[PDB]
């Protein structure tokens, strides 16, 4: 075998993470699984207008402001 260590393949600098982050226009509705995962109907901006889909809260780590706003106004 060869003995090599990992490289900094992932950037450590903060900047453009668009590849793993899309805009949250706002929440359109919500849902919860039986497995214990909560999901919301997100309108992702930056993408096509018809792209909106349900995503878990887990991906909404940045959209807590908008999500919690939703959950505040709607249960």
């Amino acid at each position: 075998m060869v003995s090599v260590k990992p490289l900094p393949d992932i950037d450590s600098n903060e900047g453009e993470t668009d590849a793993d982050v899309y805009e949250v226009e706002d929440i359109l509705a919500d849902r919860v699984n039986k497995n214990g995962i909560n999901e919301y109907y997100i309108k992702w901006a930056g993408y096509d207008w018809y792209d909106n889909t349900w995503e878990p809260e887990q991906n909404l780590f940045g959209a807590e402001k908008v999500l919690k706003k939703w959950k505040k106004r709607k249960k």
């Binding site: 793993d20 982050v21 899309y22 805009e23 949250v24 226009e25 997100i42 992702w44 901006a45 889909t53 995503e55 878990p56 991906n59 909404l60 780590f61 940045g62 959209a63 402001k65 908008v66």
Partner: peptide, 18 residues
Amino acid sequence: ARTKQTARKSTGGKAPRY
């Protein structure tokens, strides 16, 4: 810029079926 929020979007997945 417009002050707005963003989130991941799990872009990728596979349904385990045969």
